[PDB]
Amino acid sequence: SIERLGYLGFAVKDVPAWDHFLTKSVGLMAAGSAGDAALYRADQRAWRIAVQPGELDDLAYAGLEVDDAAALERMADKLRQAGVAFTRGDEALMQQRKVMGLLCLQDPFGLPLEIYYGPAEIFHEPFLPSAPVSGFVTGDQGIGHFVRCVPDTAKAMAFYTEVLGFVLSDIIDIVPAHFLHCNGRHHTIALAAFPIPKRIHHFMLQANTIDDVGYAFDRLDAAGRITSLLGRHTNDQTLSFYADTPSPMIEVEFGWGPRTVWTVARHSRTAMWGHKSV
Ligand SMILES: [Fe+3]
């Protein structure tokens, strides 16, 4: 029943660094702020990534989107029937997130998830990137995807698939990482039992052309943030590179051209070619 990943919020120590990193390096558009948070756009939505101060330096929340008010109610029922605790968002939160309905819960292991419907769009104020990027691929596939580090894969799997309704695409023995989808995007969430002290390992934005990626690589390289050379994944075939975010241990992946989802298969390497570690 979850349709797609629509937005992400980070609680970071260096907001100045995050702002600069998101605009000048990644190419997102600054969209003001909501509360203590600075907002950034990637398309027509009023915002896609929120950055706020915090000693946490990690992903503070994930917005999971559904198509209408009724579907939101159906998620309410599903969560209750599955016995998962949740809370309705109040007027304050709803207008801070610019959504029309909002259920708040958390995955086991502690990641705050927000299920919403009716987001705000601003077409009269067309998106203008802060760095040279022709555009991002969002739409029905949502904002991108992230790799959630969890202590127990089977427990995380059951929740994401059984209650949230994600479906497995395939596995890669990196620790077997499990990739799940909830729309055409090969994966919106990947679950892996990595020994890092973080909620996620990385998030990924998909650009329209290979040049977008090439240009971004140079921008991030000049900043000294590259951690992975250009490459292409085995399972979704995304062509990308990885770079360090201003928050230690969390990284970004800028990619292009992934295939869309189907049959579960198993891969032994994450890279088809490339992706050499730097
Ligand atoms: Fe990825």
UniProtKB/Swiss-Prot annotation:
Pathway: Xenobiotic degradation; biphenyl degradation; 2-hydroxy-2,4-pentadienoate and benzoate from biphenyl: step 3/4. Keywords: Aromatic hydrocarbons catabolism, Dioxygenase, Iron, Metal-binding, Oxidoreductase, Repeat. Residues 4-118, 142-257 form the VOC domain. SUPFAM superfamilies: Glyoxalase/Bleomycin resistance protein/Dihydroxybiphenyl dioxygenase (SSF54593). The keyword Metal-binding applies. CDD domains: BphC1-RGP6_C_like, BphC1-RGP6_N_like. It holds the Pfam family Glyoxalase. GO terms for molecular function: biphenyl-2,3-diol 1,2-dioxygenase activity; ferrous iron binding. InterPro entries: DiOHbiphenyl_dOase (IPR017626), Glyas_Bleomycin-R_OHBP_Dase (IPR029068), Glyas_Fos-R_dOase_dom (IPR004360), VOC (IPR037523), Xdiol_ring_cleave_dOase_1/2 (IPR000486). One of its GO terms (biological process) is xenobiotic catabolic process. Its EC number is 1.13.11.39. Homooctamer. NCBIfam families: 23dbph12diox. This is Biphenyl-2,3-diol 1,2-dioxygenase. It comes from Pseudomonas sp. (strain KKS102).
